[PDB]
Amino acid sequence: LVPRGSHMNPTRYARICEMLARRQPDLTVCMEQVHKPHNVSAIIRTADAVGVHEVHAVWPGSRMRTMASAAAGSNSWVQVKTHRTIGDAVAHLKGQGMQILATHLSDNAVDFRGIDYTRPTCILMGQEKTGITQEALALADQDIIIPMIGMVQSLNVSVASALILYEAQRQRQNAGMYLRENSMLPEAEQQRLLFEGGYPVLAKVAKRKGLPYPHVNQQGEIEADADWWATMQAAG
Template sequence: MTPERYQRIRDMLAKRQTDLTVCLENVHKPHNVSAVVRTCDAIGIHKVHAVWENQYRVRSGTAMGSQQWVNVDTHENVTDAIGALKAQNMQVLVTHLSDKAVDFRDIDYTKPTAILFGQEKYGVTDEAIAMCDQDIVIPMVGMVQSLNVSVAAALVLYEAQRQRQIAGMYDVQHLSEEECQRMLFEGGYP
């Protein structure tokens, strides 16, 4: 590995936000999953969560290599997934239009946060909604009822990035040195 590449990976690892994540509930289309993982890499998410009914892997094409740098934890079902996030003391937000939903920009994302996104056709399940702490929505003034899921994820994540940047959360390293070494070892030699 060249010194430049080593430094580039270290700089990236130094900005990873370990207490910010997303959970995809049965998001199926590979180009959507890949676009979400790519955005996660771009704003410094270290690990994403996914619930898939069937075996699945992030397709490398659209993810542009980001799947190498963002870890994906898969869960058997959404109850397990949300349980694991809550066990890490995260506020679990769910993207879902309801009477109780608030504008996604009214949330404090400097807190440990996980955001749940739903399936392309049916959205998040009732089971998941019942377990989450807060419904959030991206306002729309057009004729369509929803945005593409990778678009929705990017909007929420960049709002989190904006708030965390202002709060100086990208200026301190969150990952342990051990985890940095593991990432350098696994990802350093393509």
Template sequence: MTPERFSRITDMLNHRQPDLTLCLDKVHKSNNVSAIVRTADAVGIHQIHAVMPDRGMQVSGNTASGSQQWVQTVKHRNITQAIEHLKLKNMQIIVTNFSDKAVDFREVDYCQPSAIFLGCERDGVSAEAIALADKQITIPMIGMVQSLNVSVAAGAILYEAQRQRQLADMYGINKLPEAYCQKLLFEQGHPIYAKACRRKGLPYPKIDELGQIKANREWWALMRKPADDPGNIS
């Protein structure tokens, strides 16, 4: 791994916000999902959630521009399961909804642990999510059409959350588990060796403070054995 790539990945990890997330409530159009994932990566979202009871969520590589490699997706069978999971993480549940209870999305404190729910393209956020929400938000509009594409709405809300968190100096400190960071650094910094580890059944080695592989002689010996070596474990 080059020093430049190590620095870039490390900087990305230092800006991830594990206590800020999105939950897609049956958003099914792959181009919208991909655009949301791309924006999530851009503002430092570590993980998004998706309620997909009928079929698997697909992310278009072209629209996501590779961001799906950096943002985890957790799938849930139903909205209750998703909200219970997020409340266990002490997140406030925020839903986008047109109602008398909804406030301007800029009035919410996103520096608190927050899960923002976005609804499907046709029906919006489900009634179940609205009933279980802590807050309802809306994006003010003064045009003839009173709705935004879900990926555009996600972008507006996430950049407001980013603005608030930057003002509160919440970026720049790594808040992610060390095991996750080590795994990502190895897989994304040394992809050929990572593939070989999976093929040979070898454990991932540690990555040192310079981004290089830190492994003992036995590990290197097993890694270097050719595929046709009878002693090879692959």
């Protein structure tokens, strides 16, 4: 039911299921070639902290994708969807009814707090030290800036990401959008995450053996057939 050594219990189940109930699948960040592992990690961490289920990345090149890989996998509870180009990502995100906000200084750029983050929203962050591409700018609905009232006129991309995600968290919390009886996530995503998060080592074993993820009940116990248990316990 609950394998020895594993942390799962009725309480950790509750904590996980409450965390999924708070998940905001219509809110995301998209990293346009943001590739330094410390930035990718810090951005994912804030994404989790404001209830983002999935973040997006444009890592065109193989070295960029590989350097970023461990950081991309640093959080069991945030998946990273990779796109070849900003055209593909924005198409995909517009496809999900999301407004596309480009973190970018221009004459048309608006204070990031003037935005309604309670609607489906993608926050677009650009690279060190070059900013979002002209192509991305052409696809975005609106430029947003974080006002800087001193002499410096640039922030690190992790700090800028955190500030915009937490303005979304503020407005969503003020609108009560983290208080939910059920997750906005489909039941299948919730079971995937309960297992892949709750039993991260067993989820890898299941994948390698090409087995389905089993059901997890409110005790946090694994419910599966003798055949699943036997295959999962076989070498290796």
